Amino acid sequence: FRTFPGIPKWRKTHLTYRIVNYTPDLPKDAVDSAVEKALKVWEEVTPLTFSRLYEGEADIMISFAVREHGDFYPFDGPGNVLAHAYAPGPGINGDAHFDDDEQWTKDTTGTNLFLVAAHEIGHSLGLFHSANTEALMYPLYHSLTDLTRFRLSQDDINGIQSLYGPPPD
Ligand SMILES: [Ca+2]
Ligand SMILES: [Ca+2]
Ligand SMILES: [Ca+2]
Ligand SMILES: [Zn+2]
Ligand SMILES: [Zn+2]
C-alpha cells in the first residue's frame, strides 16, 4: 500500500456522503447500492462510519461527469480514465467524480460502478496506488467478471488500518 504526501487523512471517524447526480446508464437504486456497497468494503475494516445527506456539502461528494466539469481535470471520453477522486480534506477534497462516457454496469458487461467506486473511495479515505497486483488500490481495472469472488486484499486492509486502525471491537 501507499499513502499520499504528508499522509492526509480524516481527523474524524464519521463521514458523510452525497450522490449529487445520476447516470442515464443505470436505474437510480443501482447507483445507491453500488455506492453504499463500496462504502461497506472500507467501513468493515476500520472504525469509520457513514451517513447520507441529500442537501448541503457532504465530506464525500459523488457525481457523474463528462469531459470538462467543475475542475482542472476534464474527463477524456470513452475508456482510459474511468473516474477520479481527491484525498481527504475540505471542499472538493474527498470528492469523487465518475466519467459518464463509460457504460456503468452493475455487472461486468461494461465499467462496473461498485468496483471503481470502491477504488475511488479508497482515494477519498487517503489511500494512493499500491504496487500489489491483487490489491483494490492497484491502478489496473480488469473486467473482473468474478464479482462473486471479490475480496478486499490484505494489502488494502493494511493500508486503511495504517490510517484508521481496526474496528473498535
Ligand atoms: Ca468534500
Ligand atoms: Ca474515459
Ligand atoms: Ca454513458
Ligand atoms: Zn473532476
Ligand atoms: Zn486510482
UniProtKB/Swiss-Prot annotation:
Ca(2+) 1 binds at residues 25, 100, 102. Directly cleaved by HTRA2 to produce active form. Ca(2+) 3 binds at residues 76-77, 79, 81, 99, 102. Zn(2+) 2 binds at residues 119, 123, 129. The conserved cysteine present in the cysteine-switch motif binds the catalytic zinc ion, thus inhibiting the enzyme. The dissociation of the cysteine from the zinc ion upon the activation-peptide release activates the enzyme. Metalloproteinase with a rather broad substrate specificity that can degrade fibronectin, laminin, gelatins of type I, III, IV, and V; collagens III, IV, X, and IX, and cartilage proteoglycans. Activates different molecules including growth factors, plasminogen or other matrix metalloproteinases such as MMP9. Once released into the extracellular matrix (ECM), the inactive pro-enzyme is activated by the plasmin cascade signaling pathway. Also acts intracellularly. This is Stromelysin-1.
